[PDB]
Ligand SMILES: CC1=C(/C=C/C(C)=C/C=C/C(C)=C/C=C/C=C(C)/C=C/C=C(C)/C=C/C2=C(C)CCCC2(C)C)C(C)(C)CCC1
């Protein structure tokens with residue numbers, strides 16, 4: 020796909036694993052083998068070897084630079100590069116957008132609506148932050164019932 | 180009536196008429212006027228597809244463990260060959276699902292409209308309530324009619340057996356994803372060492 | 383004159399900040415010759431910081 | 446606590462407590478699950 | 487090949503379309519669209535002496551109103567199609 | 578009555594032949610657009626019902642499908658074999674100039690009718706057998722659009738079978754389907 | 770120089786005159802408000818154009834309005 024070799028069989032990706040441990044191994048040569056800063060570089064090497072063995076096992080595509088490239092078209096092999104964490108993101112981002120929208124409706128029908136935005140009512144906030152879990156069923160539910168959008172006759176419009 | 184949470188106020192929309200009502204709408208997914216008519220029809224197909232799902236996931240796998248059917252596992256049943264192509268059987272299903280669900284779609288939208296036959300109109304369905312198509316094709320024994328207190332109990336028994344099957348089928352799905360073993364063998368591996376075969380050990 | 387005191391009106395004046403906005407009538411002047419007698423109070427201020435403005439009855443409808 | 450919790454519910458304190466929890470969570474995700482470029486699930 | 491027959495038949499086909507087929511389609515559209523109009527008046531009516539529609543050049547003796555401009559328009563398409571055909575054949 | 582129980586819209590009352598109320602997107606909502614759509618639905622269907630015998634009957638008699646009998650014009654020499662016989666006047670500039678003259682004279686004479694009903698069904702010279710001047714008139718117009726929409730769906734089938742399976746024709750798609758019908762369906766096109 | 774225009778939305782609150790630093794505006798009698806007075810700009814040739822009157826006008830939108838036009842030595846604010 021797109022002229023990119025897989026990273027498990029890429030010679031450039033294995034070259035970057037070789038020259039990263041060798042950079043960290045030469046950093047280890049000036050420390051005692053049981054010393055505290057040498058345990059951090061030894062944990063860095065095992066973090067590096069975990070990283071390169073994770074990138075090759077996920078079917079990542081590596082170019083001529085030896086670097087893993089993401090295919091965001093919507094490929095059946097490449098769902099976890101953009102499509103799977105994008106749907107994970109939009110669920111979380113729609114959770115932020117739904118509990119901030121539902122908080123403003125809950126404080127617009129209050130005695131002092133502007134004091135509830137500088138001082139956020141946490142019992143009112145936390146009872147709808149739980150309610151933002153099921154938000155695609157509540158956003159399209161408000162879209163189908165007409166409560167999501169406001170009619171243009173009740174919207175402040177600058178003159179022509 | 181009993182509720183899902185003692186000391187919690189029941190919502191104003193779930194008033195206790197609906198069979199299976201335990202005041203369980205914490206996230207307010209059926210608040211809106213006219214919305215609880217759609218969410219019962221959604222619950223009824225999902226509960227009946229899950230009881231159809233649980234009878235095809237657990238019962239042929241249990242009888243495979245006894246060994247009187249030798250049926251393959253349900254998560255490997257899509258790889259099994261038949262007299263038809265597996266891709267072909269998808270589209271033949273959704274042409275038949277285009278008929279059966281759109282007749283069901285008009286019943287939710289316009290109740291009392293599609294109880295008559297499209298071909299031979301003397302054959303009419305005897306169901307009166309929305310979501311309960313009584314007739315010779317669906318209720319040949321006539322168990323869907325009687326007193327309203329008697330009818331509420333058997334409608335409560337559909338959804339309580341149905342919500343268990345939904346949880347069941349959702350359980351088999353995640354069990355086959357992280358353990359890759361069929362769910363009757365997951366039960367039999369839990370009656371041997373229960374404290375070592377747990378969701379933390381299977382991650 | 384005016385719609386009503388203490389009523390909810392919507393402003394039809396194009397150059398106001400509160401165009402298509404809900405406002406509360408606090409005073410209508412019944413003296414003749416006044417061009418903009420209806421005094422409408424708004425919950426939100428404009429850029430000048432005021433919420434009190436005078437409109438004609440032709441620039442308001444009851445909502 | 447009729448006014449101490451009101452101060453604790455203000456916009457800068459609740460932004461500090463949420464983003465302290467938010468960056469506290471995302472750092473602790475990045476310890477046990479580091480170098481995460483592809484979501485496997 | 488056959489330049490003298492391909493060009494003549496293709497010009498004669500488009501002139502047959504211009505006189506007997508598309509002449510009610512063209513005469514209706516030059517009356518519905520009319521003269522070009524700026525600000526409610528014609529360009530000649532607004533003061534442009536060079537925008538006057540010529541009538542001596544448009545004075546036709548054809549009974550259907552088919553003038554020499556329509557000869558120069560439909561016959562131009564018959565040569566455009568006729569040299570489309572000759573270039574496609576000679577390839 | 579394209580959906581039992583569905584409310585038919587106000588611009589589709591049922592008095593039209595074939596008025597089954599099928600307009601979910603509301604394309605015929607404009608009244609003057611809807612009068613053009615009724616004379617467009619019938620010319621299309623009548624060309625489609627002149628096309629289904631023009632596809633199957635050349636294929637069933639063995640002179641190829643409607644694609645391989647059409648590729649001769651792109652070839653410099655194809656000789657225009659009709660019923661197994663090459664016509665002498667079958668050149669691409671010859672048969673296109675006749676088609677851009679004869680059909681264009683037919684379509685310009687068709688568009689010249691001011692009546693919005695004689696544009697639909699003209700009669701007279703186009704009805705020499707006198708079935709329009711008979712006892713049944715409404716059900717034959719319902720027969721026109723039910724047969725016409727079937728051939729309109731058929732020509733849509735005809736076209737997308739050639740895109741999905743190039744080099745094969747609709748009776749050859751029928752012969753492929755008649756051998757092993759549970760393996761070779763639209764799912765071969767949907768699922769590659 | 771500058772053209773200062775008063776519109777009929779004025780309530781006669783007088784603060785456009787009080788904010789004026791070059792004595793352009795004055796309050797004349799009027800019949801279109803509760804205060805029975807409207808502003809006017811007779812000495813509009815003395816207007817610097819600072820729009821302090823527009824900053825002090827509580828009417829939405831503004832009743833006093835200053836349009837910056839041809840600028841002379843009055844409206845440039847020079848002492849040399
Ligand atoms: C029948 C008749 C008649 C006659 C007529 C005639 C004879 C006509 C002719 C006509 C003609 C004779 C015409 C022509 C025309 C032509 C033209 C008009 C041309 C043009 C051309 C063009 C323009 C072209 C172009 C081009 C070029 C140049 C180059 C490049 C390419 C192209 C091709 C594009 C009469 C009157 C007696 C009457 C009676 C009847």
Ligand code: SF4
Nearest residue numbers: 779782783785826833
């Ligand atoms: S400040 Fe504005 S409202 Fe007040 S008197 Fe001057 S012009 Fe009128």
